Design a protein around this ligand. Structure first.
Ligand SMILES: *[C@@H]1O[C@H](CO)[C@@H](O)[C@H](O)[C@H]1NC(C)=O
Ligand SMILES: *[C@@H]1O[C@H](CO)[C@@H](O)[C@H](O)[C@H]1NC(C)=O
Ligand SMILES: *[C@@H]1O[C@H](CO)[C@@H](O)[C@H](O)[C@H]1NC(C)=O
Ligand SMILES: *[C@@H]1O[C@H](CO)[C@@H](O)[C@H](O)[C@H]1NC(C)=O
Lengths: 836, 836
């Protein structure tokens, strides 16, 4: 009664007759696309009890309650899911109740029951009892809930004996259809199943059983079904068949291609009767039991149903991702594409062995077959007419095959053809004949000497750099006077150039399959005089970066073809530096402590050389005489006037252009600025301390409260010859001498006529910045009166005067205003004024 | 004393000695880059009173108050601004007060006084009095306001002498420096200026005057200064010189040049002596009295200081934007670039005439010179060695020059040279020897039949389409069995194809880079049997396009070169029913009125046709017998449970990929769905009304409250042969018959034992949807009691019963529950029950 594999039924009812003998469908089931709606409940399948894989119903016109069709379906194992679901009820025409009243558990996956016009009864199905991970149920698109009309026993429906369960605060009835309920085993069983009338089943059991605690009575087992018994594990000498049972070796190996393409054999590995042996293992020949570990080719086979898997785009190779051996032949016709190689090395650079030929055709977008790295041997079993097993035709742009210094290859059962590839010279294939054991397979016509590699120089010479010279933004370079076999041949020179901090760079990469793409181009012609060797003036170059350069003599390949040698000097690299750095960046600092200033900045933007060191000058700056001449005791001044949470909150992109224009205009101001800021350049002393390597430093031994102007010059290695960079500067203050703002000596009080008192006192020894004013607080009972004394006032009188005071005793105090802030109040000053 | 042009001073003080005689600097002034700080207030220039243009001070070390150096600077005209400013004080080293105490008004532009370390006194300058559009003033970066120290006469100690003005709620003093204030003319003058001690000046006046209301006494005029008098307009026979005066024509022409100057001689136009005459007009020789309109685009010279303005990039041509005639020669070396042409037609497609030669070299990124449209004649005054005035060298990809069906050209004073252009066929240049009057000017060597157009592509024939078989997503196309001069030549056939709804299409639209990227390539080989003419099966074509096609016979050009004839069929434009048609989309509708329903949808996605028509089938759908058998008087049901928008951003759904897989799985379901939803297809009746051309329609004559199922078919031009397309559908309800829910007949009451009352009544004639229940409201004094009667209850009894009522009289009412909603209440029903 074990129907397998999964069953498919569409377009009509009568195919249902194939399910008469099926009890546990070993696979999935499709009952779909039945538009006729011809028949009704004349097909019934009580035997069907469990589906191993998912279920899918769709457009089964004329179906109203699945419980009519499939009763007894206790559990769905759902080992293979639809997408992540084990039951798909998509847009059902006329289904009214889901039925499935005998359905008890869904081991795997979720369900999707949407778009059903008139379907209902989904709500009262507490899938928590039946299904874990219930949150993934997708039942949105069906009938609106108000028109659902969900009624069923217990909740005021006939045969009311439904039970009440709770899911998220809803302790109420559960059910399946109008007639019948949704019952669940009591907690007495725990995880164990049960039967009708609450008789608890066997532990190794699930869904239901015929008698309490009987191995053979179980309608469905819990984990594995074998020998008509539910077992917790596969018995010895038996191997787990997929899903829910064990089988003998002989059964595991006898099964062959039936219905779907089973194919010969069915492996056994790790104690399980699997289909094909897992990674890191290989089945012992055709002996259908065993495995042994392997690597590389063994882990994966790259065969294709097509004998010729041709590739015309990166996506065309997707199926070949992570594969090694193709049991067939290859064919490439990739005409256009950029970045394609970087993805060909990934999709199908793992290819190792090939059972046939390989062919390359009209591959204008490719320049080097090096992207085929893993290939080691070619069989040639499948070979082209003329016995050609490696065909390369009409490739205008191909340069050179696999790197032939360390990489080996072999073509076993055929020859190769080459033609119509003017950038691939014979030197790249003549060596291959040595390396793939194929020197004598073919004549020289199969690799024609006329149209192959015609354009390719093969080989270019190397020019000599007669002189070089750097600047701060410019480099002047020259080369030997190249003299071809016929001088009229050469017509010009090109002087490539680009920033290349790292020597790991070569122009033969082909840039954009040749030139362009970040090798900035410039040209210059040979000067008319034959006595002056070529030179140019590259300029505007970014300071502080190593610059690779090479020279190519563009020539005219005609008449004699390869005899036109071509010319290309070595890839020299030159520093920018006859140069003067472009000042620091992001200069900042603070005063962690008095006499201490921590200074930290960021590297200069265009510093004209390479990492050598920095230089910092700092000068004590004057306390402006301005503030001295001011009586702050009377000055008061007056102020004058006239995605982000901001939501959309845009700003004119033309306003960003305006800001760009303003910044650019400022920078051009700076450019015209620093021309005569430093003409041609081939009250305190300045203190200097050259930083070594890093963008940080600290200066000590500074006055507690003196402001410092900090010039910060970036100086390069060539700074000795051509001076140092211009100056970015910043001013900063030290942390005030703490407690230096308190009074150093006592106060003195003297009587004066008209009930007056003169107060005198000493002055701070080392005031922090400056003493702006003195705040005398005094009074008879409470020191309410507060008066101000300017520094000049104190200087003139050594203090101040208070006039017209009332009779009585008095206490007073004084505080100073340091440029750092308030000073400490004076100690109490006791005095008295007599009425007469 | 009129110093001109603008004055420039840098790097030292002694250059200030060029300002003794300068009263009104006719131009701008730069006093910048003075780092020496050598001298102090020994240079004084009381004469300087006004600057016509902006002023720029920067890096003037040793300067502390500008007012000392330049007193009496009454007004700045600022006709030409720095950026949009007439005064720039950027990083003023040591300036303390801006001075400018005698500065009163700024005519044009704003000021930028920023990032000065110690500058102050900006606040007390009410720029509203001096400056309009004052908002653009930008003074952010200078000394912090707290350390500014902004004080001046009056506001400090001494009796006030500055006047009080108000800007944005601050009515207080205004001033310039510590020694002097910022005085302004009283409102008595209105817009008129004034003198000291408040004597009002002349109307035609500004800044200041020496006596009240005197033309000759004005320190500065208001609009124009001429003949030692301020005037509101230029006097007749005199012509406005730039800015602030008039001049005689003799002077206008005698101003030849000085350092930075052009004309030599200024022209009088529109009543003003300008440098050059404006657009649409031409100077007639050396004439300077007047300027006459020219006519068309003559008025734009495109000369360059360089005799050879070479272009290597689009930006390299920027300066030539909007220009017509180049007084020199052209040189192009644009090797790489895409979209470049579309911008060359803009930057330099306006070029009309050229005074010399033109040269093209190494232009691999260009294929057609049509982008130079406006050129009509070439002079050749500047000519190359060998008298070559038009040179085209080393251009691999050039195909064809300007369009020669209608566009003319002439080269006057030289010949032309070509070479190394294999894709430019000689036909494009042989015609030129006719069109530019140069047929015999040069030998054929300069136009050698060799390397010139060497490769190109011969001359294409046209293939013939033997048959064009079709499908609903697939085309099968063929062509005559092409027979080259030598059969081994041809090696394959490529079949270009793309979607091209519009006839405006040609070969080079989207092929590759130079051909652009829109033509989806494919290749196919001739079948082995010579008796079967070539054919291909194109497939998977997106519906709704006139699917363009063409054929090119790829060959092996060699040995005989041009004799290799090549080929290309016509650009046929096969369309749908080659892609035979399909289904609808996007269905929506509503019911504005009873028996009326508006239907509107959108154009379909995949119908494989063209606008032909739509079809809509609507079927009355059943009022489910389900709801009939349900007593809703007692049914209650039970629910179950368990910088942009990120100002309120909920989340970022980076799972867009996961939605991608789910949606794509949905479409794969749909594809395997409609594969066999409709097998091979080469209680109410359905009603039909084919729509004509649009995506809208309406249905009438429908039951007031019946639900309708609407199938929609994208029936089309060829729906007759291969059937109509799949049916998207939707259900919708009509608007209920309003007022049909009220009772049609009276109620009747009867006595019954046990103090009971039986109520009977008629039933609605045409209920909307269905009558679910009846709400009887009744009571003795107030109809408090409300009871429910099901439709089946009424059917069985024609009404209902009330039992065990108290003695007394009673009034009652009844309301019906239509599927559309509540019905109208019954008229009052009067009855009574007696205790016995
Ligand atoms: C079911 O089994 C019976 C008995 O072997 C057989 O006659 C019948 O054809 C089978 N039908 C199906 C659908 O398996
Ligand atoms: C379904 O059965 C398995 C194994 O017996 C059990 O672990 C799972 O809990 C059951 N379903 C639910 C929803 O618990
Ligand atoms: C100013 O004018 C006087 C008198 O003509 C002349 O001697 C002197 O050189 C002039 N200086 C300048 C800077 O124009
Ligand atoms: C400057 O003078 C012009 C013309 O006399 C006048 O229109 C303008 O208002 C003056 N400046 C201000 C700020 O008003």
């Amino acid at each position: 009664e074990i129907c397998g594999p999964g069953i498919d039924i569409r377009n009509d009812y009568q195919q249902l007759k194939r399910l008469e003998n099926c009890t546990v469908i070993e696979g999935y089931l499709h009952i779909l696309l039945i538009s006729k709606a011809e028949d009704y409940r004349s097909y019934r399948f009580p035997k069907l009890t469990v589906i191993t894989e998912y279920l899918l119903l769709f457009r089964v016109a004329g179906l109203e309650s699945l419980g009519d069709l499939f009763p007894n379906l206790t559990v769905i194992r759902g080992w293979k899911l639809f997408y992540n679901y084990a039951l798909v009820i998509f847009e059902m025409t006329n289904l009214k109740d889901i039925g499935l009243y005998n359905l008890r558990n869904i081991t795997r996956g979720a369900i999707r029951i949407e778009k059903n016009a008139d379907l209902c009864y989904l709500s009262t199905v507490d899938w928590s009892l039946i299904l874990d991970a219930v949150s993934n149920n997708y039942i949105v698109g069906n009938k609106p809930p108000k028109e659902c009309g969900d009624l069923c026993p217990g909740t005021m429906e006939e045969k009311p004996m439904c039970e009440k369960t709770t899911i998220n605060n809803e302790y109420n009835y559960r059910c399946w259809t109008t007639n019948r309920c949704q019952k669940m085993c009591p907690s007495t069983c725990g995880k164990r199943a049960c039967t009708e009338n609450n008789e608890c089943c066997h532990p190794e059991c699930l869904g239901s059983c015929s008698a309490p605690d009987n191995d053979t009575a179980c309608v469905a087992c819990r984990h594995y079904y074998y020998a008509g018994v539910c077992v917790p594990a596969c018995p010895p000498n038996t191997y787990r068949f997929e899903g829910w049972r064990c089988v003998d070796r002989d059964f595991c190996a006898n099964i062959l291609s039936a219905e779907s393409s089973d194919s010969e054999g069915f492996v056994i590995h790790d104690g399980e009767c699997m289909q094909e042996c897992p990674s890191g293992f290989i089945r012992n020949g055709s002996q259908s039991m065993y495995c042994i570990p392997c690597e590389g080719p063994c882990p994966k086979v790259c065969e294709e149903e097509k004998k010729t898997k041709t590739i015309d785009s990166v996506t065309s190779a997707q199926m070949l991702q992570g594969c090694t051996i193709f049991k067939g032949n290859l064919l490439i016709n990739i005409r256009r594409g950029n970045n394609i190689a970087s993805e060909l090395e990934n999709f199908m650079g793992l290819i190792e062995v090939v059972t046939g030929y390989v062919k390359i055709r009209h591959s204008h977008a490719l320049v080097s077959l090096s992207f085929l790295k893993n290939l080691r041997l070619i069989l040639g079993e499948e070979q082209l007419e003329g016995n050609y097993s490696f065909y390369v035709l009409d490739n205008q742009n191909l340069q050179q095959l696999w790197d032939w210094d360390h990489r080996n290859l072999t073509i076993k059962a055929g020859k190769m053809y080459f033609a119509f590839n003017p950038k691939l010279c014979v030197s790249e294939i003549y060596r291959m004949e040595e390396v793939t054991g194929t020197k004598g397979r073919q004549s020289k016509g199969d690799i024609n000497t006329r149209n192959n590699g015609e354009r390719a120089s093969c080989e270019s010479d190397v020019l000599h750099f007669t002189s070089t010279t750097t600047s701060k933004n410019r480099i002047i370079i020259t080369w030997h006077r190249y003299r071809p076999p016929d001088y009229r041949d050469l017509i010009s020179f090109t002087v490539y150039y680009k920033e290349a901090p790292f020597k790991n760079v070569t122009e033969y990469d082909g840039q954009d399959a040749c030139g362009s793409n970040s090798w900035n181009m410039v040209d210059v012609d040979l000067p008319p005089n034959k006595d002056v060797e070529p030179g140019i003036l590259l300029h505007g170059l970014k300071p502080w970066t190593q610059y690779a350069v090479y020279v190519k003599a563009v020539t005219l390949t005609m008449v004699e073809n390869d005899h036109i040698r071509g010319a290309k000097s070595e890839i020299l690299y030159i520093r920018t530096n006859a140069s003067v750095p472009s000042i620091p960046l992001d200069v900042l600092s603070a005063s962690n402590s008095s006499s201490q200033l921590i200074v930290k900045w960021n590297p200069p933007s265009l510093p004209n050389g390479n990492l050598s060191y920095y230089i910092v000058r700092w000068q004590r700056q004057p306390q402006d005489g301005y503030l001295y001449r001011h009586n702050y005791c009377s000055k008061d001044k007056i102020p004058i006037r006239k995605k982000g949470p901001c939501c959309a909150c845009p700003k004119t992109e033309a306003e960003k252009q305006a800001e760009k224009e303003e910044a650019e205009y400022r920078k051009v101001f700076e450019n015209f600025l620093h021309n005569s800021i430093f003409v041609p350049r081939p009250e305190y002393p300045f203190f200097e301390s050259r930083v070594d390597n890093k963008e940080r430093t600290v200066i000590s031994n500074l006055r507690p409260f003196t402001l410092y102007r900090i010039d910060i010059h970036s100086c390069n290695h060539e700074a000795e010859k051509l001076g140092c960079s211009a100056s970015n500067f910043v001013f900063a203050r030290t942390m005030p001498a703490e407690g230096a703002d308190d009074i150093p000596g006592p106060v003195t009080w003297e009587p004066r006529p008209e009930n007056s008192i003169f107060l005198k006192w000493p002055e701070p020894e080392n005031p922090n910045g400056l003493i702006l004013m003195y705040e005398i607080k005094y009074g008879s009972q409470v020191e309410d009166q507060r008066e101000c004394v300017s520094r000049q006032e104190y200087r003139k009188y050594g203090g101040a005067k208070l006039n017209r005071l009332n009779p009585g005793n008095y206490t007073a105090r004084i505080q100073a205003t340091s440029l750092s802030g308030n000073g400490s109040w004076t100690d109490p000053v006791f005095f008295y004024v007599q009425a007469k």
